[PDB]
Protein backbone atom coordinates (compact mmCIF):
# COMPACT_ATOMS: atom_id res chain seq x y z
CA UNK A 1 0.00 0.00 0.00
CA UNK A 2 2.67 2.50 1.10
CA UNK A 3 4.72 4.17 -1.66
CA UNK A 4 8.20 5.26 -0.51
CA UNK A 5 10.32 8.12 -1.87
CA UNK A 6 12.61 7.25 -4.78
CA UNK A 7 16.03 8.93 -4.99
CA UNK A 8 16.17 9.90 -1.30
CA UNK A 9 19.41 11.56 -0.18
CA UNK A 10 19.34 10.82 3.55
CA UNK A 11 22.27 13.17 4.33
CA UNK A 12 20.16 16.20 3.32
CA UNK A 13 17.50 15.66 6.05
CA UNK A 14 19.98 16.45 8.86
CA UNK A 15 19.15 19.12 11.45
CA UNK A 16 16.24 20.44 13.51
CA UNK A 17 12.64 19.43 12.83
CA UNK A 18 9.18 19.84 14.36
CA UNK A 19 6.17 17.52 14.23
CA UNK A 20 3.50 19.68 12.57
CA UNK A 21 0.87 16.97 12.05
CA UNK A 22 0.31 13.32 12.96
CA UNK A 23 -2.03 10.60 11.74
CA UNK A 24 -2.65 6.96 12.66
CA UNK A 25 -4.84 4.00 11.72
CA UNK A 26 -5.96 3.41 15.31
CA UNK A 27 -7.23 6.24 17.53
CA UNK A 28 -5.63 4.69 20.64
CA UNK A 29 -2.15 5.16 19.13
CA UNK A 30 -2.40 8.99 19.09
CA UNK A 31 -5.29 10.03 21.37
CA UNK A 32 -3.97 11.54 24.63
CA UNK A 33 -0.40 12.79 25.11
CA UNK A 34 0.56 9.51 26.83
CA UNK A 35 -0.45 7.43 23.76
CA UNK A 36 2.13 4.86 22.48
CA UNK A 37 2.87 6.59 19.13
CA UNK A 38 2.39 10.24 20.13
CA UNK A 39 6.02 11.23 19.47
CA UNK A 40 7.52 14.65 18.75
CA UNK A 41 10.52 14.69 16.42
CA UNK A 42 13.17 17.25 17.44
CA UNK A 43 16.12 16.31 15.23
CA UNK A 44 17.20 13.98 12.44
CA UNK A 45 20.86 12.96 12.55
CA UNK A 46 21.90 10.84 9.55
CA UNK A 47 25.12 8.80 9.82
CA UNK A 48 27.95 8.35 7.26
CA UNK A 49 26.90 4.68 6.93
CA UNK A 50 23.45 5.81 5.71
CA UNK A 51 21.51 5.17 8.94
CA UNK A 52 19.17 7.70 10.54
CA UNK A 53 19.26 8.68 14.21
CA UNK A 54 15.91 10.15 15.22
CA UNK A 55 15.82 12.39 18.29
CA UNK A 56 12.31 12.81 19.68
CA UNK A 57 10.43 13.33 22.95
CA UNK A 58 7.73 11.09 24.39
CA UNK A 59 5.55 11.07 27.51
CA UNK A 60 6.81 8.50 30.04
CA UNK A 61 6.66 8.17 33.84
CA UNK A 62 4.73 11.44 34.29
CA UNK A 63 6.87 13.67 32.05
CA UNK A 64 8.41 14.30 28.62
CA UNK A 65 11.36 11.92 28.19
CA UNK A 66 14.02 12.27 25.49
CA UNK A 67 14.53 9.27 23.18
CA UNK A 68 17.10 8.41 20.52
CA UNK A 69 16.02 5.89 17.87
CA UNK A 70 18.53 4.32 15.48
CA UNK A 71 16.97 3.58 12.08
CA UNK A 72 19.10 1.00 10.26
CA UNK A 73 19.46 1.09 6.47
CA UNK A 74 17.81 -1.83 4.66
CA UNK A 75 18.14 -3.22 1.12
CA UNK A 76 15.05 -1.16 0.18
CA UNK A 77 15.83 2.59 -0.12
CA UNK A 78 13.88 5.10 2.03
CA UNK A 79 12.92 2.21 4.34
CA UNK A 80 14.69 1.85 7.68
CA UNK A 81 14.55 -0.84 10.36
CA UNK A 82 13.91 0.14 14.00
CA UNK A 83 13.37 -1.67 17.30
CA UNK A 84 11.31 0.87 19.27
CA UNK A 85 7.73 2.05 19.94
CA UNK A 86 6.48 -1.47 19.02
CA UNK A 87 7.33 -0.54 15.42
CA UNK A 88 9.92 -2.17 13.16
CA UNK A 89 9.89 0.04 10.06
CA UNK A 90 10.35 3.74 9.25
CA UNK A 91 9.22 4.75 5.76
CA UNK A 92 10.19 8.11 4.24
CA UNK A 93 7.37 9.05 1.85
CA UNK A 94 8.51 12.46 0.60
CA UNK A 95 10.66 15.50 1.37
CA UNK A 96 12.08 18.67 -0.18
CA UNK A 97 14.85 18.67 2.47
CA UNK A 98 14.66 22.42 3.28
CA UNK A 99 10.99 22.77 4.36
CA UNK A 100 9.10 19.51 4.97
CA UNK A 101 9.41 15.74 5.40
CA UNK A 102 6.69 13.08 5.42
CA UNK A 103 7.33 9.70 7.05
CA UNK A 104 5.41 6.74 8.46
CA UNK A 105 6.16 4.12 11.10
CA UNK A 106 4.68 0.63 11.18
CA UNK A 107 4.99 -2.89 12.48
CA UNK A 108 5.22 -5.36 9.59
CA UNK A 109 3.42 -8.05 11.65
CA UNK A 110 0.22 -5.96 11.81
CA UNK A 111 0.62 -2.88 9.57
CA UNK A 112 -3.08 -1.90 9.66
CA UNK A 113 -3.17 -1.52 13.48
CA UNK A 114 0.28 0.07 13.85
CA UNK A 115 0.54 2.69 11.08
CA UNK A 116 1.46 6.19 12.27
CA UNK A 117 2.52 9.02 9.95
CA UNK A 118 3.85 12.54 10.45
CA UNK A 119 4.56 15.77 8.61
CA UNK A 120 7.79 17.38 9.78
CA UNK A 121 8.89 20.98 9.20
CA UNK A 122 12.16 22.88 9.67
CA UNK A 123 10.63 25.90 11.43
CA UNK A 124 7.92 26.08 14.12
CA UNK A 125 5.34 27.56 11.72
CA UNK A 126 2.29 26.18 9.92
CA UNK A 127 3.19 25.28 6.34
CA UNK A 128 -0.12 24.91 4.48
CA UNK A 129 1.72 23.44 1.49
CA UNK A 130 3.31 20.71 3.65
CA UNK A 131 -0.10 19.81 5.10
CA UNK A 132 -1.49 19.52 1.55
CA UNK A 133 1.27 17.04 0.66
CA UNK A 134 0.58 15.19 3.92
CA UNK A 135 -3.17 14.97 3.26
CA UNK A 136 -2.57 13.71 -0.30
CA UNK A 137 -0.24 10.94 0.89
CA UNK A 138 -2.80 9.93 3.56
CA UNK A 139 -5.74 9.56 1.11
CA UNK A 140 -4.88 5.93 0.30
CA UNK A 141 -4.10 5.06 3.95
CA UNK A 142 -6.74 3.93 6.48
CA UNK A 143 -6.32 6.74 9.04
CA UNK A 144 -8.87 7.18 11.83
CA UNK A 145 -7.16 10.00 13.79
CA UNK A 146 -5.48 13.20 12.54
CA UNK A 147 -3.76 15.84 14.70
CA UNK A 148 -2.39 19.24 13.64
CA UNK A 149 -0.31 21.58 15.83
CA UNK A 150 -0.03 25.40 15.92
CA UNK A 151 3.16 27.53 16.30
CA UNK A 152 2.75 27.89 20.10
CA UNK A 153 2.44 24.11 20.54
CA UNK A 154 5.42 23.51 18.21
CA UNK A 155 7.88 25.43 20.45
CA UNK A 156 8.18 22.94 23.34
CA UNK A 157 5.91 20.29 21.73
CA UNK A 158 5.68 17.76 24.59
CA UNK A 159 5.15 19.42 27.97
CA UNK A 160 3.82 18.57 31.44
CA UNK B 1 -17.58 31.58 8.86
CA UNK B 2 -20.08 28.73 9.36
CA UNK B 3 -22.74 28.26 6.65
CA UNK B 4 -25.94 26.62 7.95
CA UNK B 5 -28.43 24.49 6.01
CA UNK B 6 -31.23 26.38 4.27
CA UNK B 7 -34.69 24.78 4.10
CA UNK B 8 -34.11 22.37 6.99
CA UNK B 9 -37.11 20.25 7.97
CA UNK B 10 -36.23 19.38 11.57
CA UNK B 11 -39.04 16.79 11.91
CA UNK B 12 -37.33 14.55 9.32
CA UNK B 13 -34.14 14.04 11.41
CA UNK B 14 -36.01 12.04 14.09
CA UNK B 15 -34.78 8.58 15.11
CA UNK B 16 -31.57 6.66 15.78
CA UNK B 17 -28.14 8.02 14.84
CA UNK B 18 -24.46 7.17 15.30
CA UNK B 19 -21.44 9.48 15.52
CA UNK B 20 -19.27 8.32 12.60
CA UNK B 21 -16.70 11.12 12.71
CA UNK B 22 -15.79 14.09 14.91
CA UNK B 23 -13.64 17.18 14.46
CA UNK B 24 -12.67 20.13 16.66
CA UNK B 25 -10.60 23.32 16.59
CA UNK B 26 -8.72 22.42 19.78
CA UNK B 27 -7.15 18.98 20.31
CA UNK B 28 -7.99 19.03 24.05
CA UNK B 29 -11.73 19.08 23.24
CA UNK B 30 -11.67 15.62 21.56
CA UNK B 31 -8.41 13.86 22.56
CA UNK B 32 -9.09 11.08 25.09
CA UNK B 33 -12.53 9.58 25.75
CA UNK B 34 -12.96 11.81 28.83
CA UNK B 35 -12.53 15.01 26.76
CA UNK B 36 -15.20 17.76 27.22
CA UNK B 37 -16.70 17.54 23.70
CA UNK B 38 -16.19 13.83 22.97
CA UNK B 39 -19.92 13.04 22.74
CA UNK B 40 -21.69 10.16 20.99
CA UNK B 41 -25.11 10.94 19.54
CA UNK B 42 -27.60 8.08 19.94
CA UNK B 43 -30.90 9.71 18.98
CA UNK B 44 -32.43 12.93 17.71
CA UNK B 45 -35.94 13.65 18.98
CA UNK B 46 -37.48 16.77 17.42
CA UNK B 47 -40.48 18.37 19.17
CA UNK B 48 -43.75 19.70 17.68
CA UNK B 49 -42.63 23.22 18.69
CA UNK B 50 -39.57 22.86 16.42
CA UNK B 51 -36.97 22.20 19.14
CA UNK B 52 -34.46 19.34 19.03
CA UNK B 53 -33.83 16.93 21.90
CA UNK B 54 -30.41 15.32 21.48
CA UNK B 55 -29.78 12.02 23.25
CA UNK B 56 -26.09 11.23 23.59
CA UNK B 57 -23.60 9.49 25.87
CA UNK B 58 -20.55 11.06 27.51
CA UNK B 59 -17.77 9.88 29.83
CA UNK B 60 -18.36 11.12 33.39
CA UNK B 61 -17.40 9.85 36.87
CA UNK B 62 -15.57 6.79 35.52
CA UNK B 63 -18.23 5.58 33.06
CA UNK B 64 -20.48 6.36 30.08
CA UNK B 65 -23.34 8.56 31.29
CA UNK B 66 -26.52 9.24 29.31
CA UNK B 67 -27.36 12.90 28.61
CA UNK B 68 -30.39 14.67 27.15
CA UNK B 69 -29.78 18.10 25.61
CA UNK B 70 -32.66 20.40 24.67
CA UNK B 71 -31.80 22.55 21.64
CA UNK B 72 -34.15 25.55 21.53
CA UNK B 73 -35.30 27.02 18.21
CA UNK B 74 -33.93 30.50 17.47
CA UNK B 75 -34.93 33.21 14.98
CA UNK B 76 -32.19 31.87 12.64
CA UNK B 77 -33.20 28.54 11.00
CA UNK B 78 -30.96 25.47 11.45
CA UNK B 79 -29.40 27.18 14.49
CA UNK B 80 -30.42 26.05 17.97
CA UNK B 81 -29.59 27.39 21.43
CA UNK B 82 -28.26 25.02 24.11
CA UNK B 83 -26.96 25.33 27.67
CA UNK B 84 -24.65 22.31 27.94
CA UNK B 85 -21.07 21.11 27.31
CA UNK B 86 -19.88 24.76 27.69
CA UNK B 87 -21.50 25.36 24.28
CA UNK B 88 -24.43 27.66 23.50
CA UNK B 89 -25.15 26.93 19.82
CA UNK B 90 -25.94 23.88 17.68
CA UNK B 91 -25.61 24.45 13.93
CA UNK B 92 -27.03 21.98 11.40
CA UNK B 93 -24.81 22.25 8.31
CA UNK B 94 -26.34 19.61 6.02
CA UNK B 95 -28.42 16.43 5.89
CA UNK B 96 -30.27 14.12 3.51
CA UNK B 97 -32.43 12.90 6.43
CA UNK B 98 -32.25 9.16 5.57
CA UNK B 99 -28.46 8.57 5.61
CA UNK B 100 -26.33 11.36 7.11
CA UNK B 101 -26.38 14.60 9.11
CA UNK B 102 -23.59 17.13 9.65
CA UNK B 103 -23.71 19.50 12.63
CA UNK B 104 -21.42 21.70 14.70
CA UNK B 105 -21.47 22.96 18.28
CA UNK B 106 -19.86 26.17 19.49
CA UNK B 107 -19.72 28.82 22.16
CA UNK B 108 -20.44 32.25 20.67
CA UNK B 109 -18.13 33.92 23.23
CA UNK B 110 -15.06 32.11 21.84
CA UNK B 111 -16.06 30.22 18.67
CA UNK B 112 -12.47 29.45 17.57
CA UNK B 113 -11.60 27.54 20.78
CA UNK B 114 -14.97 25.77 21.17
CA UNK B 115 -15.92 24.53 17.68
CA UNK B 116 -16.73 20.81 17.49
CA UNK B 117 -18.38 19.14 14.48
CA UNK B 118 -19.74 15.67 13.75
CA UNK B 119 -20.96 13.46 10.93
CA UNK B 120 -23.95 11.36 11.98
CA UNK B 121 -25.31 8.28 10.20
CA UNK B 122 -28.49 6.21 10.52
CA UNK B 123 -26.77 2.81 10.51
CA UNK B 124 -23.56 1.66 12.25
CA UNK B 125 -21.62 1.42 8.98
CA UNK B 126 -18.95 3.56 7.31
CA UNK B 127 -20.53 5.82 4.70
CA UNK B 128 -17.67 7.07 2.52
CA UNK B 129 -20.03 9.57 0.86
CA UNK B 130 -21.00 11.08 4.23
CA UNK B 131 -17.32 11.45 5.17
CA UNK B 132 -16.69 13.25 1.86
CA UNK B 133 -19.47 15.74 2.67
CA UNK B 134 -18.03 16.12 6.18
CA UNK B 135 -14.49 16.76 4.90
CA UNK B 136 -15.76 19.35 2.39
CA UNK B 137 -17.66 21.27 5.08
CA UNK B 138 -14.56 21.20 7.34
CA UNK B 139 -12.18 22.68 4.69
CA UNK B 140 -13.03 26.28 5.66
CA UNK B 141 -12.99 25.53 9.42
CA UNK B 142 -9.83 25.63 11.58
CA UNK B 143 -9.84 22.00 12.77
CA UNK B 144 -6.78 20.56 14.53
CA UNK B 145 -8.17 17.11 15.45
CA UNK B 146 -10.22 14.64 13.38
CA UNK B 147 -11.57 11.27 14.56
CA UNK B 148 -13.28 8.56 12.50
CA UNK B 149 -14.97 5.42 13.91
CA UNK B 150 -15.39 1.90 12.47
CA UNK B 151 -18.53 -0.35 12.59
CA UNK B 152 -17.35 -2.22 15.72
CA UNK B 153 -16.78 1.05 17.62
CA UNK B 154 -20.15 2.42 16.42
CA UNK B 155 -22.18 -0.36 18.12
CA UNK B 156 -21.75 0.69 21.78
CA UNK B 157 -19.75 3.87 20.97
CA UNK B 158 -18.81 5.00 24.51
CA UNK B 159 -17.66 2.12 26.70
CA UNK B 160 -15.60 1.52 29.85
ZN1 LIG C 1 23.99 0.68 10.54
ZN1 LIG D 1 -9.82 1.42 9.07
ZN1 LIG E 1 -38.85 25.50 22.93
ZN1 LIG F 1 -6.17 26.98 14.27
Domains detected in chain B: 1-160 (2.40.128.20)
* Contacts of residue A156, Cβ cutoff 8 Å, sequence gap at least 6: none
Q: Which segments of B47-99 are extended strands (E)?
A: 52-60, 63-73, 79-84, 87-95
B73–A contact, CB cutoff 8 A: no
* Contacts of residue B6, Cβ cutoff 8 Å, sequence gap at least 6: B77, B78
Residue of chain B with shortest Cα separation from A132: B139
- What backbone phi and psi angles, to 5 degrees, belong to A61? 55, 40
End-to-end CA distance of chain B: 37
Q: Which chain A residues touch B144 with a CB distance below 8 Å?
A: 147-150
To one decimal, the resolution in angstroms is: 2.4
CA of B130 relative to ligand 2 center, distance in Å: 16
Q: Are B78 and B91 spatial neighbours (Cβ–Cβ below 8 Å)? A: yes
CA of B50 relative to ligand 1 center, distance in Å: 68
Q: Which chain A residues touch B31 with a CB distance below 8 Å?
A: 31-33, 147
- What backbone phi and psi angles, to 5 degrees, belong to B14? -60, 150
Amino acid sequence: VTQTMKGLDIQKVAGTWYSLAMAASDISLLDAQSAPLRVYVEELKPTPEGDLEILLQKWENGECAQKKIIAEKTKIPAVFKIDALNENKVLVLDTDYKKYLLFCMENSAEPEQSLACQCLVRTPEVDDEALEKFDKALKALPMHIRLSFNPTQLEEQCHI
